[PDB]
Design a protein around this nucleic acid. Sequence first.
RNA 1: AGACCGAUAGCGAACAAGUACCGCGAGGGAAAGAUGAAAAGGACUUUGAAAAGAGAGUCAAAGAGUGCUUGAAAUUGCCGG
RNA 2: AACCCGGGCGCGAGCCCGGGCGGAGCGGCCGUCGGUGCAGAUCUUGGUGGUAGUAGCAAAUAUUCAAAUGAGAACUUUGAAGGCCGAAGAGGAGAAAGGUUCCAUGUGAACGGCACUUGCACAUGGGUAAGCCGAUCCUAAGGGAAGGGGUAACCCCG
RNA 3: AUGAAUGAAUUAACGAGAUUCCCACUGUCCCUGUCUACUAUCCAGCGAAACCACAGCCAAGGGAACGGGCUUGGCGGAAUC
RNA 4: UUAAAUACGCGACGGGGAUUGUAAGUGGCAGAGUGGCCUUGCUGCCACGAUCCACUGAGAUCCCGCGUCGCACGGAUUCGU
Lengths: 126, 41, 120, 51
Amino acid sequence: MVSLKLQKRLASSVLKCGKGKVWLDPNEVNEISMANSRQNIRKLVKDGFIIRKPQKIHSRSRARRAHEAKQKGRHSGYGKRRGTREARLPTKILWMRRMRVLRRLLRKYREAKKIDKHMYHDMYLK
Amino acid sequence: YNQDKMICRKCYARLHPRAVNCRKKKCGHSNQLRPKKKIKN
Amino acid sequence: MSEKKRGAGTRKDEVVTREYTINLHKRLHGCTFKKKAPNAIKEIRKFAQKAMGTTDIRIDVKLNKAIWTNGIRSVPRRVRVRISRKRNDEEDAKEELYSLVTVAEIPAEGLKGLGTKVVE
Amino acid sequence: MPSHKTFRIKQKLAKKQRQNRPIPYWIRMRTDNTIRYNAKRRHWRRTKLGF
RNA sequence: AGACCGAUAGCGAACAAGUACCGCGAGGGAAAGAUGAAAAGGACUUUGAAAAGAGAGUCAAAGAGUGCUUGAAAUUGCCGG
RNA sequence: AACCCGGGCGCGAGCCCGGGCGGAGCGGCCGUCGGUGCAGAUCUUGGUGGUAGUAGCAAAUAUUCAAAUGAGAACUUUGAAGGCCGAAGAGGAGAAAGGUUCCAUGUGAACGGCACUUGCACAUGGGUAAGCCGAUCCUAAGGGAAGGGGUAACCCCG
RNA sequence: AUGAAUGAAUUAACGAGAUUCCCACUGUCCCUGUCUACUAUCCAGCGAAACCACAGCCAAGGGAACGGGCUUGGCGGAAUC
RNA sequence: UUAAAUACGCGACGGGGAUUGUAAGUGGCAGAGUGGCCUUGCUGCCACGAUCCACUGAGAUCCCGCGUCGCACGGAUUCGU
């Protein structure tokens, strides 16, 4: 025997990280075994025999370029374009833009002064 | 109490309703908390 | 693993190596398309034993990686392996090889040249 | 929370737990008579705790 | 105390017995004795994955060697006809 | 005495002896007592054979190559390679419930439906620390304490 | 042997409710094949139950009239997968 | 049921068919569009080339072979009157 199970618990709770990221050297095996205490583990982490593995990578990269691949149209023929009809944007989502803008334009147009109080009521109602 | 505790979406660590933020390890005003929805099935 | 002479006849030996190509296909196609990759490794561990004439075979991690690289369901058709072969114990050591694409020929020659180079 | 707290069940559970220990090597020796298989000694997996 | 029973009998219980155990609970509930006159309760040595085994030692007796008096049956192995 | 094996008598229920074993109690006659005789009762209890080295140890395809340690290594542990888990067919924090199962060291008769150096098996030690978390104080279906009265009374309404 | 709130009739919507027809489609079918997976099989290891008065051939016949066995005929080299 | 230094014997090469069908690298522009540059002007260039052609009857080969290399010099177990 060597039971390394306990240094794995400790190693994880001092690199504040998982047990399948924390790695222990196969040269140092006896010295690792000798650590029974975190202050010993801390020393082996300091001296760099016990180490937190990096561990593959992302995929942001395909996806952010997928956003640049929307920027910039594309895929808006009928087929590739699909969640269901409205769900994608209910058109109440376009209204939430339109209805705030059309009232923001009408407030700007008066305060430059272009229309009368009579015309402003009718169009706002329009 | 109806507030229950707020549990962090990153770390998943539980830290009060009076604490503003999580801190389990450097979570450190990550503000990424949501409260316990206050009791189910 | 006996490149054992001893004595003979030519060949003044204990270890040297040979490069041999292990055909994975015949036994591999006998395993499942998902379960294929472990079969290959066994295939290699049985062929060297046959070719070498030794029970005790070591396969290099490199060999493990090579078979596994495509994944579980895909294994290479074949793999060239360098299999070195020394001791009274008569034990096999194996690892991966290199090739442009080509032939089976005189692999013993490169090995012989290596051992001769090692030196002073 | 505590981890159901009340002292009054909690102590007595801890007493049965202290009471479930091996017999002490000695009482086998002075001894009167027995294959001293103690016996009221109870287990985390099997049978079931009582009060 | 006895024309009682004598360890599948007598109390459920000769002993660690309303114990071990079952049931949410009311309640239910076993199996369980015996080396030897004396521990003299198996040194010392060889062996071995472990236990154990071999050899030897104690005793009237070890097929008296530790759920060890006797040791049937039902059964197993080896073996004989 | 008992047991095992045979020898003799008695139709016979059964009586008797010889050898071995056993290592302390055992008969006969008469007169009495009676938990007084089994093959059986889907009989009870215990033991034991065949069934059998038989069924099961089969659906997430999950490990493989090197190496550590060890009397012993497919399953303990390191690395690499390769996968699987995704509201959790295997992430984090907790309620109840468990009830010490946690940590460490040392083992391995039993367990783990197998190996085991391992373990949530065994043994011995050790750990849980609140003015500011929770208990705690409040009050909600109601458990109700408190007349009188039925009811012997238990007990029940108010 | 229908019949009116023991409700009659009627009826749109609804339905894992009962019956029928059409198109679409198809291995259900003609009529079966190849192929994958896990089993199977063989190896190491672990290791059970049900059941068991019974030795265990066929054709006839007989018999409480539905025989593995009586009776006569006929067959069978065991053991094992 | 095969073959075995009394042998075209085995593995590894690849030559054949009969197997599937146009590679990686490389170039052009039918054709996306857009920007800047070179120059007196004219004119052309570079850039990121969506898709296609061109160098190719290419790569891979459960079947079949002659030229090299490596190994093929062997023994366990059994008994019948």
